[PDB]
Structure formats: C-alpha cells, structure tokens
Design a protein around this nucleic acid. Structure first.
Ligand SMILES: [Mg+2]
Ligand SMILES: [Mg+2]
Ligand SMILES: [Mg+2]
Ligand SMILES: [Mg+2]
Ligand SMILES: [Mg+2]
Ligand SMILES: [Mg+2]
Ligand SMILES: [Mg+2]
Ligand SMILES: [Mg+2]
Ligand SMILES: [Mg+2]
Ligand SMILES: [Mg+2]
Ligand SMILES: [Mg+2]
Ligand SMILES: [Mg+2]
Ligand SMILES: [Mg+2]
Ligand SMILES: [Mg+2]
Ligand SMILES: [Mg+2]
Ligand SMILES: [Mg+2]
Ligand SMILES: [Mg+2]
Ligand SMILES: [Mg+2]
Ligand SMILES: [Mg+2]
Ligand SMILES: [Mg+2]
Ligand SMILES: [Mg+2]
Ligand SMILES: [Mg+2]
Ligand SMILES: [Mg+2]
Lengths: 59, 178, 141, 98, 78
RNA sequence: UCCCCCGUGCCCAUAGCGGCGUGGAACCACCCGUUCCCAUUCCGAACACGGAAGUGAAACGCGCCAGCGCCGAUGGUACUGGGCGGGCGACCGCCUGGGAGAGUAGGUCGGUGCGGGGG
RNA sequence: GGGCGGUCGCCUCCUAAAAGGUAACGGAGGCGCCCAAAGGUCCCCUCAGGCGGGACGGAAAUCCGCCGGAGAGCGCAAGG
RNA sequence: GUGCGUAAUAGCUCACUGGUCGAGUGGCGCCGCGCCGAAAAUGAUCGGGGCUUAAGCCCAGCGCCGAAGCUGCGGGUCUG
RNA sequence: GGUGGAGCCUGGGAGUGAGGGCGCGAGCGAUAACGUCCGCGUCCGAGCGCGGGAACAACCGAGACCGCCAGCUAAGGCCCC
C-alpha cells in the first residue's frame, strides 16, 4: 500500500478558515513539518485543497 | 478544398491553438472524430471558399472527406475562430446555404437603393451530385415603391426549393438624403 | 436625440462591464462594420454625433445601420448637492456595449469611402473601435 | 376533454372502481400506488341478467361475496364520470356500507 | 427633493426546512412555502398557508415524478 | 404460450398537435324514445331510464407521414470554486479541477405494469 | 454635521452574491380594511382573446361554431 | 483627366509608357520595445552615486545573500 | 477519516456593540475619493515584535518562550553605500 508524505512550505497566514482550519485536520502546524499519511480519499481531498501550501511525495 | 487533417485524443487544445492549429470535428451520420486543421490554410481557402463549396479533407487513412462548415465560433473581442464544426456529406440530400448574388441595375442606378439583405439565401437541400456552385439572381427593374421579390420567383434549377418559408428575401430601401 | 418611449421602471442600476460580447459580432446587414474593443458606455449624444457625421459626410447613397439602443438611464445628481437623499435625476439614456461588438454598419458605400467614413465616426467615440469588412465569418451552416 | 376526476383525492388508499357502459356495467377494486387489481365482477363476463339497472343487485351480492371471499373489507367507491343515481349496487357486507 | 420610498418588509423566512434522506418525527414541517410549489403525496398534509407537514415518521422522499407539480413523500420505515 | 378490444396505472410533450388509412361478429361509442326513479336560471345535448331496429360518419383505438411541435449527443468556449500575475482605472492573462444555455447532427408520433372479453 | 424637508409600524419585488439572513436619506408600490357570504360540505362547467357571421351593434352589450392548456379570473398594491 | 495655375483662357505637371543603367522593389495585417502628446508654484533626483553587446526589458539555467521561519544544542514554564 | 487550547450541557465572571485596510460579488456616488453601507475571507486593532517594499498598520513572506561569534530557506536581490 502506498503511503503519503507532505511538507508544509508556505504558512496559512493570509488564507481562509477552510485552509487554516484545514491544516488542523492533518495536525501539522509549522514550516518544514512532515508526517506519514494514509491513502484515504478524505486525506487526499484535503491534499488537493491545501496543495498550494505543501509539497506532496508518495512513500 | 484539399485541406489536410490530423487526429485528436482529448488534449489541451487551448494550448495547441497558439501556433495556428484550431480544433475541429466531422461527421455525416456517426464517427464523431476530433481533428485539428491549420489556420492559414483554413483561413486562406476560407477567404473565397464559402459555405456553398464542398471543402474536401485529406486524412492520414487515405480518405478524402467531402466536408463543409456548420459554425465558425468568433472569438468575440479577438475576431478569431476557436472551433469549426465540419460536416461530411454522405448519400443523402443534405442541407446547403448557397451565397447567391444579384446582378443588373438595382433600381435604375441613379434612383437606386442598397439591396443589402443577402442573409445567405435561406436554405436549399440537395443531393451530392446536383450540388451547385453558383446560382444567379437578377435585379431587373426594381424601383423604390413596387417590384419586390417576395420569394415567389424563387424557383431554382432542379434540387431543391426552399422547404417551408417564402418570406425572407431582399428588398429596396430609400437612400439617406440630407 | 432618441429615447425609449415606455419603461417598466424609470431608474436602474449600473452593474459591471465583464463578459465577452453576448451577441453582436457577425455583421449580417451591411458590407462593413465599426466594431468596439473596450468596455464603456454610449450616450445618445455619442449616437447623434456619430450618426450626423455619416449623412453629412457621404451623400445621395448608402443607408446607415445602427445596432445600438440606449435603455440604461444615466443618473446624475444636481450640482452642489450633498450625498444621500435619493438618486439623481435622469439626463440621457446610455447603451452598454461589450468589446468585439459591431455598433455602426454602413450600407452601399465603397471601400475607400467607407474606410474614411467609419474613420470619421470612429473619433466620435471614447472606445478603440477597429473597422472590419464583410468576411466569410458568418454563423451559417 | 370532459373529466371530473373524483379519483384524485385518495385519502383512504383503497377504492372500488365503477364503469358504466351503455350496454352493461363492470367494477373492480384497485390497490393504490402498486397497480394490482385484486378482485372484480363483470357483467357479460359472468352474464347475469339482461336489464342493465337490475345488474347492480346481483353484482353487488356477487362482488360483495367475492370481496369477502378474498378477505378485503375496508374498501371505497369512485364517482369519476357518473352520478350516484340509477344503479346503486347497495350492500351490507364489507366496510363500504352504501 | 426628499426620499420617496425607503421602506421594506421584514422577511417571513420561508424555504425547504427538511430535505430528503432525513429521519423525521410526526409533525415536522417539510417545507415552508409561499405558494404550493410542492404537492402532497403519501402521509403529507397541508395547512392554512400552503404549508405541508408529515403525518407519520420516516425517511422522506421527493419527486415521485412531475406533470402536476413537485411531490413530497413521507415514507414510513419498516 | 400469443394477437385485438375495454377498464385502471407508472413513465411527464422522444407520449401532443395537423394530415392520410382502418375497425365493429367482439367489446366501446353512435343511435331510437321518455313511460316511471331522475333534470335542465331552458332544453334527455351532459348526467338518468327502457332499449337496441340501423351505424363506425363524429368521437374513440391501432398503423403511416418529420414539418408543425418536442427531446437533443462529442468537441469548443462563455462562466466559476481554488491558486498565481497584469493594468492609473474601466477590467484582463495563466494553471488546476468543474462545466453550461443557444446552434448543429440525430431521434420520436410512444415505452412498460395489473385485471377482464374473443380467437 | 445640525437646522428646513422626508421617515418612524406591517406587507410585496429587487438590491441580496442559486440554503436562511443581510444595510443605506437605495428603486417601485400598497395597508390601518372588508365578506352571512366573498365561509364549510356536496353536485355541474371551464377562462380571456382571435377568426366567420348578426338587427340593432363604438372595433367591447347578447348568441352560435372552430382555434385557443392557461396570456383571464382568484375583493384590494406586488409575488408565488 | 493627378495636383497647381487662370474670372474663363493659355500654360506647368501627368495618371498610362520607349531606353543607355541596375538586382531587387511597394501596399499591407499582426507583434515586442520605443518618440511626440507631457506645463505649477522652497532644491533637483529611479533611495542616491551611477548604468547602453547593461548595473534596463522578454524566455531560460546553476549558484549565493537573505527573518525573531525551520532545524543544531542548552535552560524554564503549561497541558496530556 | 479527523484525540484537537476540537466539540456538546450546566453554572460563575468580565469586555465589545465609532471600526478600518486589502481582493471579489454589489448599492449610492461621477465605473471619482485613503468617500458611505452590506456579504464572502484575511490582516491591523490586540502582532507600531521581524525581513523586503528607501522610509509607512493592514502589499509579500512570517506567527517573536529565553540564550549561542552555528546552518538551511520564504518574499526580495547579487556594481557600490
Ligand atoms: Mg500572507
Ligand atoms: Mg382536456
Ligand atoms: Mg369536479
Ligand atoms: Mg361525467
Ligand atoms: Mg475612466
Ligand atoms: Mg436568498
Ligand atoms: Mg448566497
Ligand atoms: Mg371559497
Ligand atoms: Mg545578453
Ligand atoms: Mg519557533
Ligand atoms: Mg529544545
Ligand atoms: Mg479556542
Ligand atoms: Mg451603539
Ligand atoms: Mg455600529
Ligand atoms: Mg461595517
Ligand atoms: Mg473606510
Ligand atoms: Mg474605494
Ligand atoms: Mg491578529
Ligand atoms: Mg512607527
Ligand atoms: Mg521595510
Ligand atoms: Mg506589522
Ligand atoms: Mg511561537
Ligand atoms: Mg544558502
């Protein structure tokens, strides 16, 4: 099963409540923060919404 | 007449139409195949090759498609075509709009109007063998008051007539005096 | 000038000027056309000043075609009046136009005279309005 | 385009349909929003009697005993094209009771 | 030179209050409507101001299909 | 295990409209009367009742005709969440998804349940 | 800005950004009522217009036939 | 009859063309950067000095500088 | 799916009810205002703590627990200050 890792490269300062309150769904809070993630379409659906703030790699 | 063709497989084509390659599609009864043609070839032949002429389309399968135009989408603040719908003709009396024109003295040339209502000569359906290139309409004496066309003397040679209406046709308008 | 004789309501809004054309690019009446390129308004004084500049220019032949109609009342308050207290009075009806819409269409005028006449009436308008001729770009099938 | 449509209300969800032709009558009992005819009794399909308004008593007893034979009691009655006059098909068994 | 007309009514605040796929009780208003945009189906009752409500409880369903108006169907659970 | 017709339905104009056929042994309609139960701001036209000698003209079903009407595909933009820029402004450009309304091809004059009658 | 003028409550449409709400001395209008029937139930009928006519008749009174599926009407402004 | 010139004349140049020459020549439709349009009140300037195959403008590429952001380490507090 | 200074219920306790800028959808204005009034979001207010934009709250990056003569970067630049 493919895993998922993102790195936050741009802060949600200047971005709406469905961005700053969308990074709380993943639990990352700062720049250069990364974590392994499941391949669920809910988390993917968050990833294409905050895709302009993080970089995406598949583990 | 004698225009090249290619294939499309669900591309970008807003990015493909930058170098003069506008997309297209052709059909007669089925096979809605997506193509793209060249803009200076299609524009250059499309200068004089109007709706009445059967524009034939070479294809990489070796077939020559007897197509025509359905619509040219104007770019509407750029005056350009986005997408041109081709129409292959098959063994069927297909619909044609032929740009007929007017010859002769319009209304006694000094006392002449404008005769501007061209309107692409509303509709004539035709078999693929009896399809015309030019049909002539004269304007022999048609002065300002009487002598209008009214599509009653609208019997073309052969195939076919106008199907339902007889109402849209050119007329004579007064000039603009000072 | 000219004005619509009947209205449902007297005053109305302004809105925006976005959108491409919403119809009015193919000529279909005359052999030439004065087509606009920038979004602005067309007052009835701009209609009259461009319409007189045709019939005074070319004579004895050529019917002029206008495809613009002012249905938008330009609302302006009187001078030296503070803000509020309702809308202003109606002075002249304006016509909203979009870029790439053909406004003025000459009829029965040749090339070297219609380029000149549309060039004279082009300076009466605050819009960059280029001149297009009768091409094969109709909407026929 | 004449129609009265007393069949449009349908508060009671189980009706007895009546058709009166100019020769004879026939009647059904329908179950609504399902489209299944449960029981019916038709003149000239069982050919009971010649006079058309004397049919209503024998088809009332016949459709009543076939309705109780099929075990349905709470029924209703339509009046689509026709007045409640002339033929009545009055009964005393089953919950129509008219 | 004054203001001719600057008053406006308070909104009565109509609208669809219970969409389909929602479990309801007996008595819930399915839609607050001005005119009868929705026609009663099974277990649906109208009132004075064309307001239709549920007669029983269950999963509600719309659009049995048209040609007479939009339909509301309070369907019971079995 | 099938065709025709009659009731009652679901699809909601691809079901209608207009024209051309066709059917009564078999239902249904038309018809002949009103004598009573019934009725009409007036009249058996529509409800109601005896029928049924004559009929399918009308209406009603089935079949045909695309023009009348309707439905209407692939592309192509308009538009727009979201992101990135330009213009002094009026307002535009790119990427990522989504994706119309007209118009064109084409389709249609029906599809499918339940219960009865006849062969 | 205050004064002068206008308004103070309720209803309808838009502004109002396709759930609801949403302002301005923003635009267009109404109300301080009325019906023993203009109410309930039951039973019949489908409107306004256009065409062909009439005995007066405005081109509108009343009558017949066809087309007309809701452009009439629903006490009162507007919406459904 | 292309423009003058004459009250009109006359006349000068011609649109059209013959050569001894000479290998390229005009009308356009887009497109990038430019020029004029562009004159206000204490001293002028893009931050300044300066900058022309750039120290501007368009498409690129490899590096570097660049925060109290993140990590390297130490210390304190709060919650679980 | 989502264990987060997330939510839900009760009780105690204040403050606020002059807001403003920016982008979009709008009205009035003149498609004028660093003009007035709404909505969708952000920021300032309360982050005049930091870097860039010469200087400047809302233009961009970034959310300052403290310390180090350590690195990597965001916006912006690499002729000299
Ligand atoms: Mg920011
Ligand atoms: Mg009917
Ligand atoms: Mg009725
Ligand atoms: Mg009836
Ligand atoms: Mg301006
Ligand atoms: Mg709303
Ligand atoms: Mg909204
Ligand atoms: Mg009533
Ligand atoms: Mg270089
Ligand atoms: Mg930190
Ligand atoms: Mg530490
Ligand atoms: Mg909190
Ligand atoms: Mg207050
Ligand atoms: Mg306040
Ligand atoms: Mg505010
Ligand atoms: Mg402000
Ligand atoms: Mg402003
Ligand atoms: Mg803050
Ligand atoms: Mg300071
Ligand atoms: Mg700074
Ligand atoms: Mg700050
Ligand atoms: Mg911190
Ligand atoms: Mg570095």
């Amino acid at each position: 099963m493919p895993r998922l890792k993102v790195k936050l490269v741009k802060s949600p300062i200047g971005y709406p409540k469905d961005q700053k309150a969308a990074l709380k769904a993943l639990g990352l809070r700062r720049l250069q923060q990364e974590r392994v993630l499941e391949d669920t379409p809910a988390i993917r659906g968050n990833v294409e919404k905050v895709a302009h703030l993080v970089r995406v790699e598949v583990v | 007449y004698r225009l090249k063709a290619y294939y499309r497989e669900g591309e970008k084509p807003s990015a493909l139409r930058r170098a003069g390659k506008l997309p297209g599609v052709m059909y007669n009864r089925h096979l809605n195949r997506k193509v793209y043609v060249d803009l200076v070839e299609f524009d250059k032949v499309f200068r004089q090759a109007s709706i009445h002429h059967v524009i034939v389309l070479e294809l990489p399968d070796g077939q020559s498609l007897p197509t025509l135009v359905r619509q040219v989408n104007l770019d509407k603040r750029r005056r350009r075509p986005e997408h041109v719908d081709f129409f292959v003709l098959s063994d069927e009396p297909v619909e044609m709009y032929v740009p007929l024109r007017f010859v002769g003295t319009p209304a006694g040339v000094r006392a002449g109007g404008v005769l501007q209502e061209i309107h692409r000569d509303i509709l004539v359906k035709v078999s693929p063998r009896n399809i015309p290139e030019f049909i002539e309409v004269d304007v022999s004496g048609l002065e300002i008051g009487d002598s209008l066309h009214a599509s009653d003397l609208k019997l073309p040679p052969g195939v076919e007539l106008a199907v339902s209406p007889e109402e849209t046709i050119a007329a004579v308008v007064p000039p603009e005096d000072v | 000038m000219l004005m619509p004789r009947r209205m449902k309501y007297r005053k109305q809004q302004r809105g925006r000027l976005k959108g491409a054309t919403k119809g009015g690019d193919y000529v279909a009446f005359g052999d030439y056309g004065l087509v606009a390129l920038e979004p602005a308004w067309i007052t009835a004084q701009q209609i009259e000043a461009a319409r007189v500049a045709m019939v005074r220019h070319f004579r004895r032949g050529g019917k002029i075609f206008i495809r613009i109609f002012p249905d938008k009342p330009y609302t302006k308050k009187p001078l030296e009046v503070r803000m509020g207290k309702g809308k202003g009075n109606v002075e002249g009806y304006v016509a909203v136009v979009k870029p790439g819409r053909v406004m003025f269409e000459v009829a029965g005028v040749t090339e070297e005279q219609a380029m000149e006449a549309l060039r004279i009436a082009g300076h009466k308008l605050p819009i960059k309005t280029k001149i297009v001729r009768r091409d094969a770009y109709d909407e026929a099938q | 385009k004449f129609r009265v449509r007393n069949r449009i209300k349908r508060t009671g969800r189980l009706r007895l349909s009546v058709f009166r032709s100019l020769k004879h009558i026939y009647a059904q009992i329908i179950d609504d929003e399902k489209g299944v005819t449960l029981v019916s009794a038709s003149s000239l399909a069982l050919k009971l009697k010649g006079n058309k308004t004397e049919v209503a008593r024998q088809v009332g007893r016949a459709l009543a005993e076939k309705a109780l034979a099929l075990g349905i009691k709470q029924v209703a009655f339509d009046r689509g094209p026709y007045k409640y006059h002339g033929r009545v098909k009055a009964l005393a068994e089953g919950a129509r009771e008219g | 030179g004054s203001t001719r007309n600057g008053r406006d009514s308070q909104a009565k605040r109509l609208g669809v209050k219970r969409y389909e796929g929602q479990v309801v009780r007996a008595g819930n208003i399915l839609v607050r409507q001005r005119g009868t945009r929705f026609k009663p189906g099974k277990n649906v009752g109208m009132g004075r101001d064309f307001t239709l409500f549920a007669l029983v409880d269950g999963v509600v369903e719309f659009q049995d299909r048209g040609r007479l108006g939009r339909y509301v169907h309070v369907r019971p659970l079995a």
